[model samples]
Target chain A: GLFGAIAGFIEGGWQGMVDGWYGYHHSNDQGSGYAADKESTQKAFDGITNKVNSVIEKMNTQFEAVGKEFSNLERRLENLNKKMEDGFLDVWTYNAELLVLMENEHTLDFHDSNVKNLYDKVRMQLRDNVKELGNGCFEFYHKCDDECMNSVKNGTYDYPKYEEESKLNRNE
Target chain B: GLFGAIAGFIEGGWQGMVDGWYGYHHSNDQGSGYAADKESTQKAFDGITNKVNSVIEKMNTQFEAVGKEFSNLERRLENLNKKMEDGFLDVWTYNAELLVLMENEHTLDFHDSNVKNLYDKVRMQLRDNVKELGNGCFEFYHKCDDECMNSVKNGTYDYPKYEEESKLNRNE
Candidate 1:
């Protein structure tokens, strides 16, 4: 029984090889084994061997391709993660600087009349940008939070409206 | 010649099987397609199959583990990026709030000192946090920027130092 199975498998393999070779050589005048011409026989065998070798090579290449894709994806993800971490650190550091500035109250005079007005204008713009950035960060982090998003949309936070009022208040 | 090659190949194959089975059995106590006294041959077969299956399973699990790690890393990076962006925005927003507060001098007179202190504290903290975040983000994005790091270390930006002196001048 084992012999039968082995014979059958081998037969099938040979048949498949023959079929493939036939298909390839169909357009050519070379016989299935290139037996038609003396020199052609060797050429046919060589061609068949090459085709088989190529098939194996391709199979191996496909495995490598999959491995490569996985590696690339892993690298990309790593880089992205690194960038994000750096960004968070930047925010933390900047906030620290602001804390020091406030604690020292060094720039109170910088808020005086003309200077203050210019600073206010710049600061206001910066605030708006910050709010936008915060909201964006929130969204990025809480992607799954449908309720939070709904609250935003329903004017529960009224962020935009508040911003407008804030601007007016500053001018006055 | 073909028969000889075929015989040789078959003999080699059998020898390989025998050697492999003998080695496996010697170490495992499970002979080639045979079992120990109490165990059935089927059990042995199943055991070997299971081991082989486990190897394949482990390979698959490893792939998934690597894939998941990449996914998590990507998500983390995205979050960090958002935080950095938010930090920049916060700076701008705080600046705007200060401008508004300054422009309406009457409001400042009426505003609680405690509230002002709290706001200043929070703002300063936020600034410091942002700077730290920026530094972190930069580090991640550019693994090693010796010049940039050196500048920061040397107090070239000296934002905190400048703010301290400025505060003293304002108080005076």
Candidate 2:
């Protein structure tokens, strides 16, 4: 439906030209066939055709680039997940050891003040971890919010957007 | 009361000595004063006095050791909390980057299958991180469930505490 009406815009010009050629020639009989090559509209038609082709080609190339960058982003993310999982295990080991130490306080003759001091320090541990994890989850949504999402929506990348923008998307 | 009862036990021999000394001295005060050092009770009281002093010293030393270990464990836990908090931030960094990458899929022409693949892989990063954090939490309670907490509850340590025994109290 004219690419939801947007596609029909410039393309309508091309359609008009083809229709003009047909109406001019088909009804003009044998004489019109001889005049086709020399027609005054020939050069203008060539220009429009070249321009339209260039537009389509540009769209195709950029669209292809988007697909490649999307794929590369996927790979980098997967790699992060692998590394993070291993790191998680190490952190847990530390946590387990720490937790025992905290529990040990109640039984031992540790001073009340000393236990509170350790508790203050340890309480911050999980607090900070949760904050950062939440940030990790949040940042992803906003990373390229204005750039990439808008690019796809409006169908145009901002200035110097292709290569630099692609960098934001993924690795190689 | 319990320690009061125990002290009277071994020192009951002392109590008996005191009783005998009182009866003997009072019954024939002038003569028994002369009988003092030659009596078996003299060395007997001396032995009991030394034994009580030894018991107090050992109690003091062992009690101090428990405090030292308790203090050490607190520091160990605090140290891990410190290191783990920083490590959590780093993991979060990786997690954040990956999350953005996943969200990027919705915008690009990335295939649904590819999106699903990346989703499956990324799912593990946070999954692993949380388990360790939970374990850090779990380890504390379990570590001293029987050791210190039980002591605070019932009374004393080590008497074949099958499912119940401990006491939480202080000494001079």
Question: Which CAPRI level is candidate 2?
Answer: incorrect
Where does candidate 2 chain B have its weakest 10-residue lDDT segment?
Answer: B1-10
Q: What TM-score does model 2 score on chain A? A: 0.19
The window of 10 residues in a row where model 2 chain A has the poorest summed lDDT is A60-69
lDDT by candidate, in order shown: 0.33, 0.31
Q: Candidate 2, clashing residue pairs?
A: A99-B140, B150-B166, B151-B167, B152-B168, B154-B166, B155-B166, B155-B167
Model 2 bad stretches (over 4 Å): A1-172, B1-73, B110-172
User: What is the C-alpha lDDT profile of model 2 across B18-97, one tens digit per residue?
Assistant: 33321111112122221112233344456546655654565322332212323563553344344445565654554444
Question: Per-residue lDDT tens digits of candidate 2, residues A60-122?
Answer: 111111012224546764455446556778865775466456434321212222222222222
**Best-matching candidate per lDDT:** 1
Interface DockQ per candidate: 0.04, 0.01
Which digits, one per residue and each the tens of the lDDT, describe model 1 over residues A63-125?
111012225547875566566557656865785577557533422222122222222222332
User: Residue B155 lDDT in model 1?
Assistant: 31
